[PDB]
Design a protein around this nucleic acid. Structure first.
Lengths: 122, 186, 119, 184, 130
RNA sequence: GUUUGACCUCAAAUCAGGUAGGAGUACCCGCUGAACUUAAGCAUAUCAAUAAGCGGAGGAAAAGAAACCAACCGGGAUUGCCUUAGUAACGGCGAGUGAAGCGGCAAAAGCUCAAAUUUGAAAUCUGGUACCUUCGGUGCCCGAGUUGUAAUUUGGAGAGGG
RNA sequence: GUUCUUUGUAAAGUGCCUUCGAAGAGUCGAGUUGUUUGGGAAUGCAGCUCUAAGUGGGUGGUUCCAUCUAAAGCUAA
């Protein structure tokens, strides 16, 4: 009546068509298989925390965080430097303010520590 | 220590001591070549916090550049400091430009003291704190603006304000100006 | 036909040099017979004979130089590895695996432990 | 006559050192300790040469050759780095701090005489970084300090303090004032 | 092309590498217990659930004791120098157990060490001896 | 002492040992930079922060562990993909230009210096040189170096004692 | 897996008590001409004038509050 066509530039030079969608899925699965073949008994990814999303819109939702904290790791009963060797992602810049999020993470860490089998250095 | 006394001394540049120091040295640097090698840093404090270790393989070159640029304001939007760093990059092509600082200035010339590491020196090739410069991904960092001042002039930082140049302005232009079409059309 | 390499490896410097002079004379005599005839088969084999003798001569010199420069710093630029320019720079295995004094302490104190998550 | 470039530069720098009016935190140098007191400072300071690399190596191999097969006090030496001297001064561990008058960047050692007057450390600006270098196994030293001392040398050191206070600090109370270099 | 045209024409020969079948099936290396019990006909995640071990700790996008006992089996299953020993010999023979006097001694406790350091080191000495 | 000797700075040597240039250039990092065109004729604008030109790298480059985003019940390096979204904002408010946070997902990893004395000891390093188990190690020597090489310390603090 | 070496009052880590405890200047900023951006908030940058502070300083949000630590450096996928 509206329409805006951004074809005033030399658009025909930069046209990326993703024919390799099927090729790149295979490529990532081969990558995962290789990583799991090198990291044999371990999962494939670090233990990630539970986290509340920002903004009025999404604060209903609970999502994965980057890492726990020095606080959540200490309350679980271990050190940050040792947590990384057991494959627990640690976030130094994140803060602890909500009690429900805190306790959920501590129990996630505690249940993780019961389920694991750490190998000795010998 | 001793360098805190130096650091806070060189923050006063028009103060009568450093006024006199700068008066003698500006003239003395005019009498020498344009690009010549410094015996040792004039400001060892600022050299050291920019990562100059006084050991074999570490070089200080002193450099001079003309100032300024509506014909007389046809701009040339690259800095004086990046120009200086590039010139010492070409005269000393075996070295790698680590960092550079301001030393003295004038109506016509701004002076700098570039700091250079010898990546072929065995006192650099060992010691795991400085042997990163031997990796061939650092051949002429000053020519691609990977130094402190180059990263400034490129506008590479974090935030809202640097959205047009955060991954590099050429990269972000090429990315956002691409008609991306999938197998099953979105 | 022609001369064989393994037969010549047993020989000394003087024996091979004399051998070479004889082959160069023989080839020089065959180039005088070449112009009278349409074809000559032996001219090809003697050329390859000379080439072989020179290779054994050079190999015997080079390995002698390898023995007097044995196990020391700075051997000749031809007797050195060729590899490629970009690899004849680029930190050596010692200089690359060289870790700082602090990181070795951190690696003994906290090595990446092996684990499995279920029981 | 025609001289080289660098010769002309250092001669020009020499006459420039004189003919300019200079700020009083500089020219507080060159108003330096006289010949007798300088010789007497070094007659003490030469008794505390830091054990040279050869001497240290031979002694510590003597420790190994003896102690591995079949008590000592802490030894006293002069203290000689600028980071370490300005560490020692302000901790008041310095009894005599010797400062060179000729330093490559002058800006390095400009705070030091006045920081010594502040802390109450009895300082002396002595002539020559080479001359300080000699007593310390280095080419140059910029600074040399004497923290602790053997009791034989203690009374001599205390008198060296009092001689330097009287000879240096009292004669040069006018040097905190007066811009130097007004020579016609 | 320009270079490829010559290389497909020359008598040098191509450096042919047939490394395509090796891209899919990479042998498991880091654990011999897993190396014996890994069905290569199954995938990565299928070989994890077959053994029991959790493959991804975050819940995946999309739709989804035989060996772990053997692991559990293999997981449930600093001396002193000559000079240090002879130093502790000297301290015990001269003092015995008076750690206050033992650490205030300039002749034997040359390094001005505490009481706790001395009783710990002496008990290490006493356990290795009678 | 009208002598001798420390340094400082500046040189030279077919000195010992090294290293830089040129090629390729799809992608990548910079510098430099138009016009035809399109807008009503048209100094803005547009094509376009494009092409051409010049420099500089690698298998990727660049970016990157906040002087970040937000306004929440807060998230948490970068990069990339879907989404935001032709949205916010810009523009003779004209032709036209035009993001980002959030959410989902791919992939994920963290660290290191300078600035506080090793001062009961420059603990550091390069080269030469003789051996050895030689991408190195050891011995001795010349040096670099206190105008600061090592160990400790980097905010997640950290350090000295008990 | 097997095997040879490990050392020296050597190098760490955990928790508590006790005593201390610095953080990148011709840089931020301000003005200014020019370039540049979606960035009207003046978006970034460059030149030139002038040029800071440490219960600092920057960036946001309706009396204040929140969140970062600049002007040094490395790092796979």
């Amino acid at each position: 009546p509206i329409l805006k066509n951004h074809f005033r530039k030399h658009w025909q030079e930069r046209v990326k068509v993703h024919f390799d969608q099927a090729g790149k899925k295979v490529s990532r699965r081969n990558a995962r298989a290789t990583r799991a073949a090198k990291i044999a008994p371990r999962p494939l990814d670090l233990l990630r925390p539970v986290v509340r999303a920002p903004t009025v819109k999404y604060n209903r939702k609970v999502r994965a965080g980057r890492g726990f904290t020095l606080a959540e790791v200490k309350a679980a009963g271990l050190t940050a430097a040792y947590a990384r060797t057991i494959g627990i992602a640690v976030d130094h810049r994140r803060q602890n303010r909500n009690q429900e999020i805190f306790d959920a993470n501590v129990q996630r860490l505690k249940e993780y520590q019961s389920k694991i089998i750490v190998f000795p250095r010998n | 220590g001793a360098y805190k006394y130096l650091e806070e001394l060189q923050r006063k540049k028009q103060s009568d001591v450093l006024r006199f120091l700068q008066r003698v040295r500006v003239w003395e640097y005019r009498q020498k070549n344009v690009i010549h090698r410094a015996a040792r840093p004039t400001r060892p404090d600022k050299a050291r916090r920019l990562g100059y270790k006084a050991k074999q393989g570490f070089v200080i070159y002193r450099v001079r550049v003309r100032r300024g640029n509506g014909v007389n304001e046809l701009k040339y939007q690259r800095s004086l400091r990046a120009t200086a760093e590039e010139r010492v990059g070409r005269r000393a092509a075996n070295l790698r430009v680590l960092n550079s600082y301001w030393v003295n200035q004038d109506s016509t010339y701004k002076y700098f003291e570039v700091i250079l590491v010898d990546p072929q020196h065995k006192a650099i090739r060992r010691d795991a704190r400085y042997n990163w410069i031997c990796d061939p991904v650092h051949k002429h960092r000053e020519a691609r603006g990977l130094t402190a001042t180059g990263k400034k002039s490129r506008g590479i930082n974090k935030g809202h304000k640097f959205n047009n140049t955060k991954a590099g302005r050429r990269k972000t232009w090429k990315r956002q100006n691409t008609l991306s079409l999938w197998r099953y059309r979105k | 036909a022609g001369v064989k390499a393994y037969e010549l490896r047993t020989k000394s410097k003087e024996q091979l040099a004399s051998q070479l002079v004889d082959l160069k004379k023989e080839l020089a005599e065959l180039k005088v017979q070449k112009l009278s005839r349409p074809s000559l088969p032996k001219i090809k084999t003697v050329r390859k004979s000379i080439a072989c003798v020179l290779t054994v001569i050079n190999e015997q010199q080079r390995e002698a130089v390898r023995q007097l420069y044995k196990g020391k710093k700075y051997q000749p630029k031809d007797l050195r590895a060729k590899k490629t320019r970009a690899l004849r720079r680029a930190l050596t295995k010692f200089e690359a695996s060289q870790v700082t004094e602090k990181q070795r302490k951190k690696q003994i104190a906290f090595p990446q432990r092996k684990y499995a998550i279920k029981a | 006559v025609k001289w080289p470039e660098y010769v002309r530069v250092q001669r020009q720098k020499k006459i420039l050192s004189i003919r300019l009016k200079v700020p009083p935190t500089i020219a507080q140098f060159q108003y330096t300790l006289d010949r007798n007191t300088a010789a007497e400072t070094f007659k003490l300071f030469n008794k505390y040469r830091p054990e040279t690399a050869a001497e240290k190596k031979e002694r510590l191999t003597k420790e190994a050759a003896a102690v591995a097969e079949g008590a000592s006090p802490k030894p006293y030496a002069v203290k000689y780095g600028l980071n370490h001297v300005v560490a020692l001064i302000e901790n008041k561990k310095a009894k005599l701090v010797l400062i060179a008058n000729d330093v490559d960047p002058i800006e390095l050692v400009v705070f030091l005489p006045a920081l010594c007057k502040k802390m109450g450390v009895p300082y002396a600006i002595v002539k020559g970084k080479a001359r300080l270098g000699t007593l310390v196994n280095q080419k140059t030293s910029a600074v040399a300090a004497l923290t602790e001392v053997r009791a034989e040398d203690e009374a001599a050191l205390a008198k060296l303090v009092s001689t330097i206070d009287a000879n240096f600090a009292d004669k040069y109370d006018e040097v905190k004032k007066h811009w130097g270099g007004g020579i016609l | 092309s320009v270079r490829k045209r010559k290389m497909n024409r020359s008598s040098v020969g191509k450096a042919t590498r047939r490394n395509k079948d090796k891209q899919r099936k990479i042998n498991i290396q880091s654990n011999p217990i897993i190396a014996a019990n890994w069905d290569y006909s199954l995938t990565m995640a299928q070989n994890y659930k077959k053994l029991g071990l959790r493959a991804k700790l975050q819940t995946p996008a999309g739709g989804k004791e035989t060996e772990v006992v053997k692991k559990l089996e293999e997981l449930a299953s600093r001396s002193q120098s000559e000079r240090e020993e002879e130093w502790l010999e000297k301290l015990y023979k001269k003092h015995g157990d008076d750690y206050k006097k033992m650490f205030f001694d300039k002749k034997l406790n040359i390094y001005q060490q505490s009481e706790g350091d001395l009783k710990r080191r002496l008990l290490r000495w006493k356990k290795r001896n009678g």
